[PDB]
């Protein structure tokens, strides 16, 4: 096989060093922390050099994106949008922020090759055609398209989140259904991760970079959205029971002069 790539996007830590340690470390506070992977290839260790770049911060990270993305490396790029569940506003804002950073990267680094544009757009249009079958209509897909998969951290803190400020299924259901909506609109999927739990990322990241996995919504705490488990009806049924159907205001809900003049006036 060729060279595989993964761009993990940490949002001010958020357990990125710990999550990269669980698969196979100083800290993560500067940016562009290259990491190498060794994933089993169903028979032996065929040296699947899936390069992992840890990007954190915002102080001129476009150069780090340039050093982390090549020209012919673009198809096997499985970026990992990481956002910790402890701060839901950080997830809601950081997901669109990393999506905007990816859009700027495509609008500034993917534009020089002309044949790659006409090949990559048709490759995404055909990749989304195979994304929905073999899982177990049409959604408002955006302009970004490449094999993507969002992974959320701090998922084994349901009691902590409901003890701090949630205390109702509205917040957790809002985050679940809205991140499901964001992943279906972005042409991605959603696989939750936790502290020594929810080992389901390697299955889909190995399944897409070419060993399958089913969906889990019964537990509601370890939610896994595989590639091809999205529509425009189940997402509406999720945020309907006791939750407002598509609210636009709940985001803020879950987010010698003076003394001399005085003496002169007294003197007169």
């Amino acid at each position: 096989p060729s060279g595989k790539n993964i761009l993990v996007f940490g949002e001010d830590g958020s357990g990125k060093t710990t999550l990269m340690t669980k698969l196979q470390h100083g800290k993560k506070g500067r940016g562009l922390e290259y990491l190498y992977l060794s994933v089993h290839d169903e028979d032996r260790d065929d040296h699947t050099r899936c390069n992992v770049w840890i990007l954190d911060g915002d102080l001129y990270h476009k150069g780090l994106l340039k050093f982390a993305v090549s020209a012919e490396s673009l198809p096997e790029t499985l970026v990992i949008f990481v956002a910790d569940m402890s701060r839901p506003w950080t997830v809601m804002e950081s997901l669109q922020k990393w999506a905007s950073v990816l859009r700027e990267h495509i609008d500034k680094m993917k534009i020089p090759p002309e044949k790659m544009r006409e090949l990559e757009r048709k490759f995404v249009k055909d990749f989304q055609d195979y994304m929905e079958p073999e899982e177990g209509d049409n959604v408002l897909t955006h302009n970004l398209g490449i094999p993507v998969l969002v992974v959320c951290t701090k998922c084994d803190a349901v009691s902590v989140l409901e003890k701090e400020h949630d205390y109702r299924d509205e917040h957790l259901d809002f985050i679940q259904s809205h991140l499901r909506r964001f992943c279906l609109q972005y042409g991605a999927a959603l696989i939750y991760t936790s502290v020594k739990e929810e080992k389901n990322l390697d299955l889909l990241y190995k399944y897409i970079v070419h060993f399958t996995t089913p969906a889990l919504v019964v537990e509601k705490d370890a939610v896994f959205i595989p590639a091809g488990w999205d529509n425009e009806k189940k997402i509406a049924i999720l945020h309907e029971n006791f939750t407002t159907v598509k609210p636009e205001d709940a985001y803020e809900d879950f987010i010698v002069f003076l003394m001399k003049q005085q003496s002169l006036l007294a003197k007169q």
Partner: protein, 36 residues
């Protein structure tokens, strides 16, 4: 065939200490915030 590090080596360490460009003053030179 692990011999393709030239791509990263092209611009490996050009900015090993670029965390101090705070518009020459900024009055709060720190790439983070404290507690409350």
């Amino acid at each position: 065939q692990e011999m393709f590090a030239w791509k990263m080596v092209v611009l490996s360490l050009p900015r090993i200490q670029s965390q101090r460009y705070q518009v020459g003053v900024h009055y709060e030179l720190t790439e983070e915030e404290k507690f409350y």
